[PDB]
Amino acid sequence: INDNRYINGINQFYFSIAEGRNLTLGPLLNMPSFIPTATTPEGCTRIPSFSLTKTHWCYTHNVILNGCQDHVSSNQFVSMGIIEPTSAGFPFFRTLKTLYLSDGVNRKSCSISTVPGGCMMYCFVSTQPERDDYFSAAPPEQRIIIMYYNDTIVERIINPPGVLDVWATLNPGTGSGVYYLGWVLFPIYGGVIKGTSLWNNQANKYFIPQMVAALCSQNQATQVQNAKSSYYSSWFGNRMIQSGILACPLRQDLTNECLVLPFSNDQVLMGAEGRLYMYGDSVYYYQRSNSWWPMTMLYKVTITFTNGQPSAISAQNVPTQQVPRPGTGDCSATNRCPGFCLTGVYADAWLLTNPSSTSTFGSEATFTGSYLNTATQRINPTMYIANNTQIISSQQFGSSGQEAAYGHTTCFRDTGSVMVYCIYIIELSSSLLGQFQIVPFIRQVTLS
Amino acid sequence: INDNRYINGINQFYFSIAEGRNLTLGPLLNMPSFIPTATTPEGCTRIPSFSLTKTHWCYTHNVILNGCQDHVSSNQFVSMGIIEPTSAGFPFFRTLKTLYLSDGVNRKSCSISTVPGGCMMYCFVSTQPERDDYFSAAPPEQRIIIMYYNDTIVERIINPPGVLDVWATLNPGTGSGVYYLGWVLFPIYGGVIKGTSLWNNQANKYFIPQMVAALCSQNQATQVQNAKSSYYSSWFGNRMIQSGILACPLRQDLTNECLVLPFSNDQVLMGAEGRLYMYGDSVYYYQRSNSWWPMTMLYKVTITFTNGQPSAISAQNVPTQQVPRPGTGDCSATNRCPGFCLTGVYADAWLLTNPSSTSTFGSEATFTGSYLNTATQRINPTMYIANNTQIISSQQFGSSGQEAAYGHTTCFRDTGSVMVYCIYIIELSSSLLGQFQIVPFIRQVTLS
Amino acid sequence: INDNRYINGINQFYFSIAEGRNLTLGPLLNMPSFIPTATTPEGCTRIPSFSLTKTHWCYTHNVILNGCQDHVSSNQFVSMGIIEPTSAGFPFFRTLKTLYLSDGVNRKSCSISTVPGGCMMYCFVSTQPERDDYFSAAPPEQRIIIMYYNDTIVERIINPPGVLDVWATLNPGTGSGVYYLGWVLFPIYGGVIKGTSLWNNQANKYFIPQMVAALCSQNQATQVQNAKSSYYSSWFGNRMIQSGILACPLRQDLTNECLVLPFSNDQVLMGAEGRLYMYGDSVYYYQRSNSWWPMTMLYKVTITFTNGQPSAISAQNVPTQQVPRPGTGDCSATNRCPGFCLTGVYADAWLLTNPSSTSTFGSEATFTGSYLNTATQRINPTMYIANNTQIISSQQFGSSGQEAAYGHTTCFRDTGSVMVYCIYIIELSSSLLGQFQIVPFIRQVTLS
Amino acid sequence: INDNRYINGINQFYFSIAEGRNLTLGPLLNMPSFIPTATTPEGCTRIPSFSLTKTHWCYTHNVILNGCQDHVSSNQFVSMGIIEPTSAGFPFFRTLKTLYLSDGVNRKSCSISTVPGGCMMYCFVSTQPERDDYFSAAPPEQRIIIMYYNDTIVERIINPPGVLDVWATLNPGTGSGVYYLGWVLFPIYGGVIKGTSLWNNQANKYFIPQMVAALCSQNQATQVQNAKSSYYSSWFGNRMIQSGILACPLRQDLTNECLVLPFSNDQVLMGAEGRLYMYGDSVYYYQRSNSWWPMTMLYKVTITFTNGQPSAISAQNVPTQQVPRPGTGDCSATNRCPGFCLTGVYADAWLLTNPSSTSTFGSEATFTGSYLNTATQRINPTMYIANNTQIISSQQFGSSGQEAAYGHTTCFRDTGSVMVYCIYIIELSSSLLGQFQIVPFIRQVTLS
């Protein structure tokens, strides 16, 4: 279990609106990395997922032996432990168990989540190029693995209702899932088949960020038309790219009890990887901007239960125009107009301030994370702190040109020294060992 | 506990003299590294120690926050686990516990050793520059820490007899120690004070490798004179630099039961870092060439017990002229003549063949490890396989100019697939994160 | 252990009814304070708890680094020792052990109690403003820590039955607890949820001090109506503010063996901080007047055991109209009429005379303590001796305007010189170091 | 025993000459004070002594019940404990034992010193006004008390040789003593009788600080004449006011084994209170400027042993002109010319840099402490850091006019966080409780 210095500083809004204005990033602190490195030049470690909770943390990432492309073989590294203070005062993520799922099953796009006494991981089994998954009417196999700290492992092949013949594909969003009211929730996305109820109920729906108008040159009518079309991809088997949540009851005999809950396309953008968070009793969702809007997307999710079962989800977006992401073509970090896009990067963000603390939801929100500072390339990884309109603190890592990919940010407070530490897990392109080196950078978020 | 595939392939001579002739290094295999990385550009991780045994393995290294020089602050990372096969067939070092001794005590030059149910680590507490330790008549504080897999930790400040007023300094050799007949043996070295019994008994003693004559241009008389003098250092407080073994009975209340057993300078070269090995029932010793002879030094150690206590050690050197080490001045990799030197690097070697299997001890010995291929710089790390006179297989890592430091090599056999794997733990100078990146390279040693 | 001069003069009624009439406060005596001072101008030390017993005494208070408001960080200072005579004849509280619980867990409103061989402390973990605790249906975490004189420390998170889903919050009364018949009893208070058994059983109950009629201008019917309503607070999440006792068996593995025993609202006023005393074999309770009645509240508690377990408590009030406390609005020291109030200060009182010694319980009771002599401000700290209707001896400390807060009074007798000493622990507002300076004033209570 | 974070950061020079130039005082940190407060307005706590060592610390001060003048009654408070880190990272002086010597013996001017397993305190028994001690040919009674942590107390009346009929009076310097090579050394001072060997051997000797010339307007001849005369006081019974060291072997049966070692008046100024320090293996002495030179006086003391017994002491002054002290008349902080003076205050200083590290002893020395910033009054207590000529960092405490008296400064390093903390024990005049409040201020000495 985590040290007494952290058990009460996890999953919360750490600063008041007033304090968010005077926040800044401290120097990077040096701790023993708890994320394993490749031991060959071409070894590839990518797609991390990290979950932290009151009692412990869970970590995982995919390992491919040669290069980063392979749809036949890969192993999945899983790790878990606690946080404890060092004599310098800052955190040390102590690993208490390690696992390396290496058995021939190609588990991909895995999302992990802390659960009482262990970790629950959700993956899909890849047997062909991603694009082929969207064309095949059959969805990939889905699996959720529970790894207890007592070393018991239970893996199940799940078949949630409304997936077969509805979704051509279904993937975990790779971002962490969360344990909420006895259920484990995972972010999901994929492509829905034309003519299905979902498709029909989703018909004519679209979402446009509050701050697009002022920045977009097209008129309202044109925007609405392009927005509606951005949810359908001809390149990906002509499917409606949908975002959603997978809810699984915490059981060791899961089969078809997990529920697929898709977001209304009236509240969310085109489906993409994502991450679920927990701030107090509130669930939040991060959605990768793989569509036309290149800015960070965060939503407060309201979950409805009917007979003790999640029955519907509603998402309220925190309006911002800050922290863009590198895209391709007419969907670079400079784009502001609706249209169909299918490019981007995963770069979640952590809210240091409560969006509900302002009379108008998210009118003044502060968040932190990392982003690739460039219009179209995955270059210049930069850690930052920002509000809805501007970046108020930032520090690029390495020299310009430095390649990087995804970034997962998590913050917690030391209730002992009363300081907030954030960990920025960034996939860095390395020249020495392996294609990438997933690094858990850690630094303090100073008030002043 | 280790997988059934390894419990019977540990600490042995894996090949016959005939087979050693046809051995070669396979490609480097990619596994999740079990050695933690620094998370800042200037963070320094150095001086690793690794012990593997039938049941499990122990690992540790020193961590300094800024740069690699600091005689006030450092933390020591400890790790332990087992070996298990992956679906590709090769090993995966599974970490089952992690520890980060961070409390203000500056533990340095630590040597670690596997023990039933945990690890035993030996360190000395550094409070001043190394050179100052040799000038001060008082030896640094010595400590042995026992870390059980059940998470109990017992640390003791030891005061073995014959240290106070005999040794001005005393350090663990950083190389792994071994668990032999109920005792934990650690390699040690340091400086002895003039006029002490040890000094007197050591007087006029010297050792000259069997293969020096043919390579040295000085006459026998001149060599013997220079050799005798190479054991005394005016730069290091005018002490006799001595090598030896620290024997501690496996107890949780250690005080003065550990015994300091110095090697006869008639059988070993000037004191230096070292490592102890176990091949079957035989103990072996590796001695860093920090003196005039720049070639790999291995010895079969014969331990004598008197009343259930180690009473004396004898060392028989495996005569070789292979695998040189970068030195400074007239002590570069090209030196062959006796004289006083105090330069070099730690680069142990693993014997793949039994030296006692030949009518004349070590007449045809094969070993493997890594070395820095250059005369005076710590550059061009190269993994190899060699016999007494030549390198019969080798592969440099990275491009020329690549900086590196120490190298610890360990081999074991997969009794399942019947292949030998060796792990080469090399301190690599990295440009991205940290001063060094200690990498556990792993590859197979192929017969053919 | 305490000196022979005090082991037989602890926890008793020291004077007879006749003697109480001729009692007076001697001069303040100067002894080395055993309560630690802050070392910064804004450092805050508040909320002390003190327990004295035949063998020794226990002391504790909360420390906040900046100012007196913080619901994230605080440390708790614990101290313990004995009493021994000085050459001047008066007491000296000799500290034999000190502890500073500083680890990130925000322990608040702690109550301490002497136990054979150490101290037992009860605290709740604060993670948000007090008011928020009443609105949240979940109660704060509860903990009891046992600190043995032999330096062993055992802390447990307790979950007594009937708390979850019954009490929205639960706090220790900060006043000392007591060790009675093998159990440790602590005063508690908090808010109960509407619709719960407790709430229902407590419905329509109210208590009115015997001496209110003669001083209140409202008629009996109006008083009863207002009294009934004074137990419910809309400002504090619409909960029934309840007072009670927490009974814990003296064990090192406490979990859910502690029992919550609430007082009947027919015998006690609205819940508030409190303190438990021991006079001979009788347990007494002090209840802070945080409601409409501004006078000192003391009750003789009768505890019922069923199968060796505390099963119910009954409280009999010592009727008085003396020693008022500063309040706010229509609840100042001058108020005498029932109604809902939520203002006041902690100012316990020590009974120098037995209330059961008169044909009519408490018809002539004498007590001592300190109080803030003003109607609405926390000003003019004054030590006194009083009977039910009047203050028969008193001495204000400092000049008018002097700020102060809580006051804990404890008396004991020197069986050697046959004099009674009382210690008045008062939180004094200081101008030099720290927000407050908790001072253990000590003086004799003279007969004549 | 002290925490592992401090056992290796005690009694040393913490910074290099280069680093001393960039040092500054951090904010005052708030910790629970370990120095007891008075509990009456006129109670007087004065003359503290503090000793810190690798294993623990010792503290003591005098307590007079009414006012600060009394030569009949006083008690002496003794305290001892260890240092341990708090969750905020800074020190907490944990008291593990307390003692209050209250028995009628008027122990005064006590100096305390850490010793293996306890404290050794040296006091003299006062039975009359100080001035009368100088006129009486008989010296006051001398006593050394040893207080073991195991609660054994041994007090002895010592009669060292060469005191009776040589010294009219003899007092401990109140500053801490030190445990050196098996002996406890205490600073002493007093008045020597005319015609005694000491007096004669001391005849015509005088000392003039290296930096007086440049600041004094008198010529060399005049200075030497006035300097010689400054060692004799007609007001104090016409005695030679001498400074020195009392060396006692660590024994429980001390009688006349302690040795009085006076300083040569050719190396030290007129006798005064003082303190002994230990920096590594070197002993240092602080001498109160109770004479004409108003600046901080520090000396490196070289102790000579003859047959295992201290036989002579030599003192080398660290030349400075910084940190003056309030004096009276022609001896205020502005005085620079030799002459007879008998005014001043105790204000020791801690060397943060080694004086022997410069080619010319003390050419660039940095020290810290507190001083009363005013020419003649004991007002404006100010903590500072200074070099030989200037104050490079300082912060006055309280508002101008604030009265204070003595100041004892001690620094140590946290080898964990690598920061230096200094504790400044200052006697502050308080308006609330007691004449003075001896406060242990603590703050960090930052490099940058």
Ligand SMILES: *[C@@H]1O[C@H](CO)[C@@H](O[C@@H]2O[C@H](CO)[C@@H](O)[C@H](O)[C@H]2NC(C)=O)[C@H](O)[C@H]1NC(C)=O
């Ligand atoms: C490790 O912990 C898990 C968590 O409880 C144990 O799981 C139980 O497994 C049994 C059957 O194997 C089920 O009937 C229980 O319902 C499970 N407990 C619950 C409710 O989670 C698991 O058995 C533990 N490992 C072992 C066997 O020691």
Ligand SMILES: *[C@@H]1O[C@H](CO)[C@@H](O[C@@H]2O[C@H](CO)[C@@H](O)[C@H](O)[C@H]2NC(C)=O)[C@H](O)[C@H]1NC(C)=O
């Ligand atoms: C985000 O932060 C920026 C910078 O801190 C805010 O912009 C400042 O707004 C104030 C007025 O409130 C101006 O006085 C400053 O000049 C602005 N800074 C500059 C020059 O950019 C911005 O208001 C914040 N956005 C919000 C409200 O979320």
Ligand SMILES: *[C@@H]1O[C@H](CO)[C@@H](O[C@@H]2O[C@H](CO)[C@@H](O)[C@H](O)[C@H]2NC(C)=O)[C@H](O)[C@H]1NC(C)=O
């Ligand atoms: C973890 O394993 C060790 C290894 O045995 C246990 O050590 C024993 O400790 C007790 C006292 O603590 C000794 O009296 C025994 O002799 C030790 N066993 C031996 C011979 O090694 C240790 O106690 C275990 N941890 C716990 C307490 O569960």
Ligand SMILES: *[C@@H]1O[C@H](CO)[C@@H](O[C@@H]2O[C@H](CO)[C@@H](O)[C@H](O)[C@H]2NC(C)=O)[C@H](O)[C@H]1NC(C)=O
């Ligand atoms: C070490 O290995 C080398 C190379 O394998 C051995 O040298 C060979 O020796 C054979 C005779 O036994 C010759 O026929 C080859 O021509 C040699 N190789 C060359 C060209 O270098 C060497 O003998 C081995 N050293 C020993 C005996 O340990």
Ligand SMILES: *[C@@H]1O[C@H](CO)[C@@H](O[C@@H]2O[C@H](CO)[C@@H](O)[C@H](O)[C@H]2NC(C)=O)[C@H](O)[C@H]1NC(C)=O
């Ligand atoms: C509390 O103390 C007061 C004062 O000591 C008592 O009042 C006195 O009562 C006697 C009669 O018993 C009168 O002769 C005095 O004149 C009263 N003193 C004055 C002038 O106030 C009072 O009776 C006591 N209250 C009780 C009975 O507890």
Ligand SMILES: *[C@@H]1O[C@H](CO)[C@@H](O[C@@H]2O[C@H](CO)[C@@H](O)[C@H](O)[C@H]2NC(C)=O)[C@H](O)[C@H]1NC(C)=O
């Ligand atoms: C507390 O510790 C001291 C320190 O040793 C003990 O002192 C010993 O006392 C005996 C006689 O009382 C002497 O003969 C020894 O020489 C002392 N030890 C030394 C060398 O310091 C003391 O006895 C201890 N308290 C007790 C009695 O438990």
Ligand SMILES: *[C@@H]1O[C@H](CO)[C@@H](O[C@@H]2O[C@H](CO)[C@@H](O)[C@H](O)[C@H]2NC(C)=O)[C@H](O)[C@H]1NC(C)=O
């Ligand atoms: C003590 O500190 C002062 C201030 O840091 C030193 O004075 C500075 O000396 C440098 C040259 O070495 C000048 O460039 C600065 O202008 C000086 N500061 C000022 C304006 O006072 C002083 O030299 C130090 N004394 C020593 C050498 O111990």
Ligand SMILES: *[C@H]1O[C@H](CO)[C@@H](O)[C@H](O)[C@H]1NC(C)=O
């Ligand atoms: C933050 O800093 C600004 C500028 O120094 C200051 O005025 C403001 O009060 C601070 N805000 C808070 C409440 O921390």
Ligand SMILES: *[C@H]1O[C@H](CO)[C@@H](O)[C@H](O)[C@H]1NC(C)=O
């Ligand atoms: C090794 O290889 C050589 C050359 O192919 C072969 O002649 C020899 O028999 C082999 N040695 C053994 C016994 O493995």
Ligand SMILES: *[C@H]1O[C@H](CO)[C@@H](O)[C@H](O)[C@H]1NC(C)=O
């Ligand atoms: C107390 O004092 C009164 C007045 O001097 C005296 O009459 C009375 O007897 C005393 N009471 C007792 C019993 O102490």
Ligand SMILES: *[C@H]1O[C@H](CO)[C@@H](O)[C@H](O)[C@H]1NC(C)=O
């Ligand atoms: C101290 O600070 C000065 C000014 O910033 C800098 O130039 C100097 O290098 C520092 N000195 C050291 C060695 O700390």
Ligand SMILES: [Ca+2]
């Ligand atoms: Ca498909």
Ligand SMILES: [Ca+2]
């Ligand atoms: Ca030494």
Ligand SMILES: [Ca+2]
């Ligand atoms: Ca609540």
Ligand SMILES: [Ca+2]
């Ligand atoms: Ca005298």
